[PDB]
Amino acid sequence: SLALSLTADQMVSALLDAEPPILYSEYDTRPFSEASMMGLLTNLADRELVHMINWAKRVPGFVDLTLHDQVHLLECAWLEILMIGLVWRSMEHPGKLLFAPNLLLDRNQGKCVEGMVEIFDMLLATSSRFRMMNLQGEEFVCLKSIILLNSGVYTFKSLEEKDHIHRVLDKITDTLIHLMAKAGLTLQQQHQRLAQLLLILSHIRHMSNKGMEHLYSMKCKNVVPLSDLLLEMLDAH
């Protein structure tokens, strides 16, 4: 299907063109309470999810899947995707997390919410790693698409579906290497960098699982209400 016959450059363009916008937090912005920070983030994540759902539809290969499979992948991947986005946006702000242009939080503001500073620290470490690696926008969009396709693929005939996903994943791998080769990296450097990028995805998975625990923990405590969509996505884990 369409996705498999795209060139590397066509794949990258498609992914770049699919990028969701950067959203703003609610401006309504004093020193933060636990409940207020929670409220801001919850509201922001909910709005972001709507844009992510529409981004996913523009990822070549994704709409080729059945609705059930698209749902499964999104339910598995959504928090990883929010996280890698956050980490990407925060690259140019060492020591801080750019949740939105009007919501740039440092580590100590992570203490406003109980158990949040752990996840913050992991996110900050990920941002540093991307900076140390000099991650490029074109690489980022590839990684984000890999997360979408990879994260639920092992937990599904639902075999020709798996094969298609694995074929798309192979295409994105080709695209990543292409980009590295164009940037003038040696063969050795290309396979080394590819490995380094993909190994970070293990850490992103870990962060997602910790964040999901945290999110379920805040639901039980009913400290702020979660949106219907967030609760739907959370229920899927």
């Binding site: 759902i53 539809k57 609705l67 749902v71 999104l74 339910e75 969509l229 996505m233």
Partner: peptide, 9 residues
């Protein structure tokens, strides 16, 4: 459910 709506829009 909501996911289904948003995926079909």
């Amino acid at each position: 459910k909501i996911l289904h709506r948003l995926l079909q829009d």
